[PDB]
Amino acid sequence: GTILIDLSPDDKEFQSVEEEMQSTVREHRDGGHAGGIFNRYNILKIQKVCNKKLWERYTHRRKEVSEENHNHANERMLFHGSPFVNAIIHKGFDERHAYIGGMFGAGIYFAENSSKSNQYVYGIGGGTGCPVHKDRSCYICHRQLLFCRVTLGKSFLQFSA
Template sequence: MSNQWVEGYTLEEVETSHKDYGWIVSKVKKSGGTFNIKKVFRIKNSSTWNAYQMTREAIFYEMGRKRVPEQRLFHGSPWAMQIAEQGFKIEYARSSGACGAGIYFSSKSSESYQYSCKNGSQTNVYLLVCKVALGVTVSGNRLEAGTHSVISGTKHVIYNETQAYPSYLIQII
């Protein structure tokens, strides 16, 4: 696996012997995942990464130059391949969610897996591991002024699509 980045988008398979593969398998199992992992891919998307970096920097200044809380969280979607390639799109968020029209993540792989399924163009099921800049969080089910994300149990919700960077794509058997 290469640490070099190129302009644009690439998926790079993570070898089973690589430490990142072991870390992901461990994170999945420790958070309730009982599904079998077929492959893990590292997502390299320069435009999505640059947008994430800019948003994280903006949050840094909004927080008075304090360290921005970030977490690696799971995201399940039948559109995982499209998210890997294009990033998250807030316009596709449904307002019927428990915390409104946001982008939902979980610290539990088993919870996010429930939202992973094949869509018409995919032959496999995928789960994303994302780096999420949570910023100032609020507990509950609605974003409040001066906050960047909502936490409700194991759910983390953001309302700015560039607050998350999809960094790994897990192919599930």
């Protein structure tokens, strides 16, 4: 029961999402290996994802966490890059989207840097790049990211390299 509503590039909601996307690009220590070499994006489209069931499921869990954390869900908007975005928007996140060999263990990973989530769009380490040209740095093929509402609650703080 998912529908996608196109945002107009004239809408301020389109604009604030574009801005969070563009302004969170950074350089990566792999020199562009996984995600390619770019300082910015050409945004082609931004769609709002509407699914009643998946939303009620999210808000039910958010209240539980909130009640366990002095009424503070500690909700963020973060980026997720994945080969399975089409499954995610129709059936929601589950253990099939977990990053088993992730630095912080087998869970679902999100980034503040849009450019970080971009490195996973074609798979872990960028996989073999775009399906059409096998190019991790393809400037032609269309990519897709998700900008997601994430409930962090009480977050365990892990300093890392």
